[PDB]
Amino acid sequence: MRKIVINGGLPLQGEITISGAKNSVVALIPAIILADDVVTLDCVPDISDVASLVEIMELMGATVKRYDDVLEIDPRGVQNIPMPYGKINSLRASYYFYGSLLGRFGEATVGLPRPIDLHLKAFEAMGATASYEGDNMKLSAKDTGLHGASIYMDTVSVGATINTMIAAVKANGRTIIENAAREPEIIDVATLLNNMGAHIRGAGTNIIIIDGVERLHGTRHQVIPDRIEAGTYISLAAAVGKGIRINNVLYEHLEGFIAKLEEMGVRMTVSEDSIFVEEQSNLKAINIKTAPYPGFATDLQQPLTPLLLRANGRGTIVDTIYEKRVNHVFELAKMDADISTTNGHILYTGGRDLRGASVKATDLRAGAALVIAGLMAEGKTEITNIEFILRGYSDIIEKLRNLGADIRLVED
Template sequence: MKKIIINGNKPLNGEVTISGAKNSTVALIPASILADSMVTLEGIPDIQDVRSLIEILEEFNVAVTFDAEAGIMNIDPSNMISIPMPTGKIKNLRASYYFMGAILSKYGEGVIGLPGGCNLGPRPIDQHIKGFEALGATVRNEMGAIYLTSPEDGLKGDRIYLDVVSIGATINTILASVRAKGRTIIENAAKEPEIIDVCTLLNNMGAKIRGAGTDVIRIDGVHSLHGCRHTVIPDRIEAGTYLAAAAAMGEEVLVKNVIVEHLEGFVAKMDEMGVNMEIGEDSILIRKSDDLKMVHIKALPYPGFATDLQQPITPLMLKAAGDGTIIDTVYPKRVNHIAELRRMGAGIKVESDTIFMQGPNAMSGAEVKASDLRAGACLVIAGLMAKGTTTITGVENILRGYDGIVDKLTALGADISMVEEEN
């Protein structure tokens, strides 16, 4: 069992470079199997979700090489075979569901275990299934697995209205439709930068997709897709996490490899709090920020404040003066970090899915558990702020999405280490 140990209240200084986007990568890798030759992805983060996806690709007899230090992955699906996907590996990460759309598109049929990932409350895949069925597929749920079958004459494009704005359903429907006959129109599509990233890859592979980044995406089906080279966009959630840490404990921290436009909702709230920022073309400099003001946050689909950043910004808010609230309209049950922050002395509570807090808070080190990926990031920042020693368990959740988090924070001056103990 891994643990992260933080001796807190140490100032941060220096530079940190943001890795490729986790939420893009976990869709780009399944999308790559639609090619008939080698796909090279650059800027791939070295995270556990990537390792899990590599294992799944190898089950499909896809040739994969990953240079973790250089962040380069080569995916050659030319000898791929279609087999039922093993449930055990699927349970390791939710994003494995992107293989549904890719396998259905490539083979016309497939068997895929239901996805796992962080426990953030109900996250149904009914909109994914709605997209597949609109294209003509038959979808059955038997014994915890999804059975996908296309008609004998193949999938056909159609007009699909998603009842809720869903990144996963938007991407999965795109993957299923890129080789369908005719035109597919997805209405009420999600607009996240990661969707644009996936569509850029697919278009470079020969797909015909227009409208990515808007709420209407049009896909004209093509007969085949070829290999290409593609660079992953920077991770806006990792960037926001380090910006929050720098605002909380930094004297002067430069966060590099940032697309500022992807962080507008987050940066606006930091500005409202009074964080001392200097925004560059592809970087943000954070200087020591005192006398912070509390804010109210509502997490919304893009371009609103990202749900994945409401947990990482919470410790920074606890440093600010006044009363604040967080309402997450995307995942209202995303509150598992609150009880852990209370262990550290935070004045924070949850009532009817609304987080209430009062500040400023002086937190103390404690033993806490990372229940999910972004809750883990929240607790790391809280540990950096707290006096004394914080021990975080559930570290596997953090490693799912943060590339080299201990090394990056150590380079900034944090007293942080990861230890491994027997259960």
């Protein structure tokens, strides 16, 4: 079993590039099926989910050219065929094919082995009912096709919002989505569709209005950066770096995260789609309270924690999304960090230097914190159970080594 060995204390310096948003690309790819021509995607992350999606597109009749970070997909040869369960079960959001095939063919036969009910509830309003026979579900629209409807999301859902929006652009009439998700991935998908010739308004707000169109042409879209991976490296560069420029990062997708950094005293210049983090000193301890977008992302409270340990004073970290996301606390405490837990609150007192130890990555974002803390601590830090970290952050070991860090993979 492999592990990450880190000798910290060294100042980091150089350039680093953020990969494409995973949560966005999984919706962009199946949405291409609606197009009548080739659609090109730029800045596509090289992850297992993308590779899996490409195989499915190819199995349904789509030709795909893959090179650099670019995906050229021709959806013209896509056939209306059922999707086998043994090919879609390994997918994150395979339900994004639902709204895709509904707008394209008016039906979708899916294999079965509940947050998916909100998707169906929206499809129901658009005249699409789901039949169940054996181990298969077939979403079938009316003979006239999908039609617009006033949909109020009883629960804020990123998936249900996107899936509804995908099936709405090629429907008949006006579709209004109230209480919709405001996440950046919603805007990214809507941007792709609008550039294909759709009519989407209010993307990014609580009210999205879609005016259906008959045909959709091709276009070229650039996938938005992973805002979480961005905030991870920004927190890293501020903690141990002395001059790191984070490339391919949208400042407008980290409004809440940036505001908290400025409260600490984090100095940084912003130009183009990049952020240059200077060498930090005299940081102030702040309080963190996670919230739905554009609130403080719950997937950023852990990678920010080591930077808070660099700060001076005491603060409090509260996660309203996941009240039990504290599996990083004990591991950081093993590195001589003044961090503890009570109820749901995460107490911390930054200021004192950390010491290298043998820690285990419990989850993805927690392990990212251990890496940052590993670069801070004096001595050697060995992190076990890191297979999901290497998948969460593509080429992370090489990226940090190019920053001047003594990070290394050891297959034990």
